[PDB]
Amino acid sequence: FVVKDIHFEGLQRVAVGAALLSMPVRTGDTVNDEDISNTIRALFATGNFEDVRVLRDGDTLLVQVKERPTIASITFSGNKSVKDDMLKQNLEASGVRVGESLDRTTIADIEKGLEDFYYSVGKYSASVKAVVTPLPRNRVDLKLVFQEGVSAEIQQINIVGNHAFTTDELISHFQLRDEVPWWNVVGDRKYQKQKLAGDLETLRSYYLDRGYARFNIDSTQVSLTPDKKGIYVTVNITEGDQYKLSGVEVSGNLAGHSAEIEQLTKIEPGELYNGTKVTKMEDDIKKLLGRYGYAYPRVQSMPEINDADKTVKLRVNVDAGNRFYVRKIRFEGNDTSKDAVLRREMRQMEGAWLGSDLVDQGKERLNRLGFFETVDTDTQRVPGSPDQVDVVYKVKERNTGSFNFGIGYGTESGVSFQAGVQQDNWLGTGYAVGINGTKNDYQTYAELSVTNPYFTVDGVSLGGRLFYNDFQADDADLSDYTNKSYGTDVTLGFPINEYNSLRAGLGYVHNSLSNMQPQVAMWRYLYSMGEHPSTSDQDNSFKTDDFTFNYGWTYNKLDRGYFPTDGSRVNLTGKVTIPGSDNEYYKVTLDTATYVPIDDDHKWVVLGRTRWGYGDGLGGKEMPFYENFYAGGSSTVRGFQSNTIGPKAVYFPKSDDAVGGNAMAVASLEFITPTPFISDKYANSVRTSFFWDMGTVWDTNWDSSQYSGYPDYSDPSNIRMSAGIALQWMSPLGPLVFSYAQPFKKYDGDKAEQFQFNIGKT
């Protein structure tokens, strides 16, 4: 047979010219059944068709073919466990995408791919089906239906071979969890291989930190329950004896700093081996070699062990490397935030010698802002220069605007509500604005604030606020009056060190008082101000306007933000009225908290707290009665009802109502011990303590000589005391703390409240 022509049928989409180019045979060629078979198998090999059929017609080589149907629609059903976009990402494999061509023969591959995907999610019993429907013009649509099954969970975590420690102590630090109480927050019983590897390396570190130089992990097995609901984890370990440290030595390309490195490497004899100390020593060697301008200092250490003496000798090798210089720093991805907003956070200077630790800590500084989802870094050698590089940062922004709401309860103030909206990166400028409000039983508050974190390039900040307040005293168990106020402040921040900073600013406040119940302590102040209200009536009012100068200082070296075990925190604040205002007074406060561990494991610690306050008028006038100090309650002295400590009211026509005083002193001492009866797997999440409290409040201006029939409220000798027990943990509803204490030294007007608690943020 000779090709007079080639005739096509069914080529509705695939080009006839493309097929004519694609066959191994052309017009005029001698053809047999072998060439016909080659043509049809080649057309099958093209992949555009599902059913190729060919024939030897009278005057042409006939090809009649149905092309592969084109998929025009993808739909899902029953997939609610996993996101539709996640399904779309998963189906990117195997050429399953809209607009392309496929066949029904590959459905099982999709089935098994989806099954494997949900197995990787942990849905070991999931099942999937597909339904396929064709359409004219050789179009086709498909739908996918999903059954999620049941997600497996970890049943037990077991360690065999340990003898030095109990298994619960080792389990307690792992990411995976086998027991989760309903009243605590410790995690979830999901299984992930990355978390398993992290737990394995944490277990290795836990033994390397205590002198077990010969520690090794033999094998690990993961087992599945026959119903495929539970997962079992078991690790095999073996540990030898503890080893002592005999000494260290260092050699290599030290580049002349050998004595300075050697003075850093010395360790006293008799200490146990410690991998954390070894790593810290080598990191300090890298840092010290890095401040001399080397870009990539490389160090390495291997331990030499002697099994006869149970001693380890440490060998360290150091390679200085070379010097590079930074030619340019570029940012990309910041399509909204200003360039300077990112460039401010860097620690590497452009046009200076490179520092790798500086680049990493600049990445961390940029990541701490929270404006970006992810941060990446790359160092690229500029072409044609042996020793110049460019540093490039990759960022992806996120929406910083949010609105938040909260609720809590406690004996101190009852039900509390919180609500507000905030925007941290206004127009990509770095400014922060927000509006906030709060309501308690006895107080209602609202404010609006604006803050510029960089008023000066060194970190000096500038901000202000505008507020409104509404305080009603009788609902707080005080003497009856009502105070509504508004004003505005402006303040500066000035950091001078990593741990402490200064503060200063100005402010204005306007006060309005009403419904004042007549009493001698209040009307002393009114007479001092020069007003003579009517003793028999309750319907008096008073107005004042003041300008104040504020300052402060804070010191904070605490070990960690939650459940600290070491450090101290001190805060001092002041206030004074500049001339031209109505009142003339000053006030100063100071409080202190410090932790002193008594155990090497930092599970037995001692806590001590204090609080002081003082204030008086400048001349002639007195401090207003609404600026007084208060004591008692869960915040100040446990065991006493809120605001009950101090002087008491004396009406004009004595009672348990407290009025507070213009001087205060409070002290406390507390012992923290491990919880006795919680299982060790999560015993560290609950803190239990015993305390001893004391404090007093007195009014320095009380003229005792004219009021012999009443106690002396100017005497600071009336010290109150109490002692008890308290405990706290993180509830699913939020932070939670309980207390029970009994006062063993009280006076006539003090009302006790033995059981106190608080739930959530208040």
């Binding site: 309860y409 004996t411 103030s413 009852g414 039900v415 039983d441 006895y442 609902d475 168990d477 009802q641 009302k751 006790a752 409240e753």
Partner: peptide, 13 residues
């Protein structure tokens, strides 16, 4: 005892 606000506490002795 009385329900002063939402807190429950002694207004008595």
């Amino acid at each position: 005892f009385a329900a002063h606000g939402s807190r429950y506490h002694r207004h008595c002795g």
